[PDB]
Design a protein around this ligand. Structure first.
Ligand SMILES: CC(C)(COP(=O)(O)OP(=O)(O)OC[C@H]1O[C@@H](n2cnc3c(N)ncnc32)[C@H](O)[C@@H]1OP(=O)(O)O)[C@@H](O)C(=O)NCCC(=O)NCCS
Ligand SMILES: [Mg+2]
Length: 718
């Protein structure tokens, strides 16, 4: 479909004209005229920034190569990085001015959920994860141990159930305490004189803090639920003395509901596999339907978005809390182009520019509640939140800002409607973080330590230095501990408190929920106002940490400190005279090869961009591209310095591959790699990301995955 200078695929063109544009008050002929111009005016920069990356990698590649056996002189390294304009200066103190942002980003501290947007089922559950059942999260997972004769099964178990009930009672005791007595003793709740009254065997009692009573449902004389609030997050006690769980409870408590996933990132990036116009539109569709509010998915059940929740207030008025997680959308970074719309010469258009345009325009519908726009509003303050990933340095951030500003003109939106959540997940950003924050000083809504892509850039940036530590050891290196702290320092010194989120990384062990409750608390304790979780269940559980830690306080306590030097940030995580025994090296390669084949096989064959892949210790892991980035990069490093040979990788890939078939054997759609490995696009793709990983730009895995999936798809219609 010829438009100005463009060949827009009809699948996109139809979608954008019929589905997306009506109701936006944007003239379809003008919209596409804006598109043409933006793409034209801004493609040079996009390539210029991308070229600037490759150059810097080569210079840094040169530098390490012409230096061996005489350990890194860290002052020459730092001077080198300044000479080439990698390590740009540090700007003067400032305060972000970003306005028009929702309370749930500026003020509320709680879990943030990230879901693949190509999956309507998970997306719906994600936006609905704002509110989650604490009973289901504890009963369903290993938080309540299955031992001591308390196993779960197809029939509800009292023994497990009472452990669940008890846990939650401790929680309520710990968070919204009774004046006197414990929740585990309650016999019923009432509301007298606009105050919560909790009946006990010995007395009746209010709350230690009457201001933690938020409201209720049903008759005051005997409510159906009681609504509480601690650290700005809501807790609901569901009452039904005639329920499966109710009749077993001293107060007839049915369930405790926690306000969990406050915000959700609807993901077009590492979570998903979209390599052409079709895929692209398919996820653009889901984003539109979330923003309209009408998105539905069949399961005899239809899954829709939750409506807002009504309550009676203490004094007696009716009010409304939001039923839905406030959505961001993660666009893709500055790297990839896409089939979707091409040049006359056949050059593809940058995917990132197109996301900004189509994702921006669609999000319009999520700011209003009309007939054309659909019933549910997302940002009640009038903002569009876009997570911008994999940015390298301040200039690339400024580019996103400029891109956003042109996408605002084209959409007729007021300037700065499009807010940017900034990933801190590339070295060049990490060492120039203050500068990145300044470049988006009027747009930024968060920073987040994407430790995973960050680990990826650490291996690739420093590819020629020598052998790296095994990936399990990365978590305790100088560079990563400084980067976490450094992120929080910079955010806080930019006045992020009350204005924007300081975000931390994802929990990848989806089955170790007992671990996550125990371990992840460290993030809020480190001052993170939000952090990333892999599921609504996880979100409900992470919620617990924000009831315990007072994040706002921790931020106040941390203000002004400087817990990281630039030497700590540039400390390269090298092996440095650590000789792994024969077994270890065979473990790392084996480990990494399973994680790769596990993820890539479902990527290239099934078009699935996020998967549960069990490792060589059989811990289920949530793998995506960032995890693939580490895995492949590390193996490349070990190859570049001959810890392994090319042959070593093959043999491991070859023995790991049949195993991933065994764990995938129950799938209807799955086609296995063994025994004929060389006639398997999947296998060959995994093999490319290792044997040619040293040559991918900044270690990114998109070039190969996109090309290999494009390949597979053609060899599927043919
Ligand atoms: C990999 C994955 C398919 C594994 O699935 P699984 O846990 O083995 O199987 P299920 O999802 O059916 O587990 C049960 C429930 O978990 C929910 N779920 C799991 N991850 C979810 C996610 N992050 N968002 C919303 N719901 C999720 C499902 O909705 C499902 O309930 P349902 O019957 O109502 O659909 C899935 O968890 C996933 O895509 N990863 C999480 C997304 C993510 O965090 N990625 C970000 C990468 S940066
Ligand atoms: Mg990332």
């Amino acid at each position: 479909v010829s438009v100005g200078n463009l060949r827009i695929a009809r699948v996109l063109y139809d979608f954008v004209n019929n589905e997306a544009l009506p109701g936006t008050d944007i003239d379809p002929d003008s919209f596409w005229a804006g598109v043409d111009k933006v793409v034209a005016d801004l493609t040079p920069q996009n390539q210029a920034l991308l070229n600037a990356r490759d150059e810097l990698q080569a210079q840094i590649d040169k530098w390490h190569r012409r230096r061996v056996i005489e350990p890194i002189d860290m002052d020459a390294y730092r001077q080198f990085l300044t000479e080439i304009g990698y390590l740009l200066p540090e700007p003067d103190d400032f305060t972000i001015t970003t306005s028009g942002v929702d309370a749930e980003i500026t003020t509320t501290a709680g879990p943030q959920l990230v879901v693949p947007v190509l999956n309507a089922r998970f997306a719906l559950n994600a936006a609905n994860a704002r509110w989650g059942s604490l009973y289901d999260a504890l009963y369903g997972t290993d938080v309540i141990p299955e031992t001591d004769g308390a196993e779960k099964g197809p029939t509800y178990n009292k023994v497990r159930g009472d452990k669940v009930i008890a846990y939650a009672r401790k929680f309520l005791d710990d968070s919204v305490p009774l004046s006197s007595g414990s929740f585990g003793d309650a016999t019923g709740f009432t509301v007298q004189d606009g105050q919560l009254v909790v009946a006990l065997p010995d007395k009746s009692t209010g709350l230690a803090n009457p201001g933690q009573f938020a409201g209720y449902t049903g008759a005051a004389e005997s409510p159906t639920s009681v609504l509480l609030i601690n650290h700005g997050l809501h807790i609901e006690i569901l009452i039904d003395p005639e329920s499966q769980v109710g009749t077993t409870d001293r107060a007839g408590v049915k369930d405790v509901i926690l306000e969990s996933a406050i915000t959700t990132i609807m993901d077009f990036e590492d979570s998903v596999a979209a390599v052409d116009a079709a895929d692209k539109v398919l996820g653009y569709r889901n984003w539109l339907g979330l923003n309209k509010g009408d998105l539905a998915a069949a399961v005899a059940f239809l899954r829709v978005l939750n409506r807002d929740r009504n309550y009676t207030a203490p004094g007696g008025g009716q009010f409304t809390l939001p039923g839905r997680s406030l959505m961001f959308v993660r666009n893709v970074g500055h790297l990839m182009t896409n089939d979707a719309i091409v040049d006359t010469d056949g050059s593809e258009v940058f995917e990132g520019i197109m996301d900004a345009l189509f994702t921006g325009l669609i999000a319009i519908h999520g700011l209003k509640a009309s007939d054309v726009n659909g019933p549910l509003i997302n940002s009640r303050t009038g903002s569009i939140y876009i997570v911008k990933p994999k940015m390298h340095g301040p200039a690339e951030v400024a580019f996103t800002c400029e891109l956003f500003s042109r996408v605002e003109d084209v959409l007729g939106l007021p300037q700065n409607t499009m807010k940017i959540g900034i990933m801190d997940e590339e070295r060049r950003t990490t060492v120039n973080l203050k500068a990145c924050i300044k470049a988006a000083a009027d747009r930024v809504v968060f920073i987040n330590t994407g430790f995973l892509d960050r680990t990826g850039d650490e291996i690739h940036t420093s590819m020629e230095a020598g052998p790296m530590v095994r990936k399990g050891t990365m978590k305790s290196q100088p560079w990563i501990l400084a980067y976490e702290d450094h992120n929080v320092d910079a955010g806080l010194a930019a006045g992020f408190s009350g204005r924007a989120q300081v975000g931390k990384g994802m929990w990848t062990m989806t089955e170790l929920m007992a671990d996550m409750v125990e371990t992840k608390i460290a993030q809020p304790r480190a001052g993170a106002s939000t952090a990333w979780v892999p599921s609504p269940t996880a979100a409900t559980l992470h919620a617990l940490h924000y009831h315990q830690v007072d994040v706002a306080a921790v931020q106040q306590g941390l203000a002004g400190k400087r817990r990281a030097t630039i030497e700590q940030l540039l400390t390269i995580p090298l092996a440095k005279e650590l000789a792994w025994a024969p077994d270890e090296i065979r473990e790392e390669v084996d480990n990494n090869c399973q994680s790769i084949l596990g993820y890539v096989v479902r990527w290239v064959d099934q078009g699935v961009g996020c998967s549960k892949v069990p490792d060589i210790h059989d811990v289920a892991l949530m793998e995506d591209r960032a995890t693939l980035r580490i895995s492949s990069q590390l193996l490349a490093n070990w190859l570049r310095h001959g810890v392994i040979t090319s042959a070593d990788v093959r043999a491991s890939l070859e023995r790991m591959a049949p195993l991933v078939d065994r764990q995938n054997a129950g799938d209807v759609a799955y086609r296995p790699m063994a025994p004929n490995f060389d006639d398997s696009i999947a296998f060959l793709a995994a093999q490319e990301l290792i044997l040619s990983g040293a040559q991918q730009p900044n270690g990114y895995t998109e070039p190969i995955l996109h090309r290999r999936r494009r390949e597979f798809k053609a060899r599927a219609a043919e």
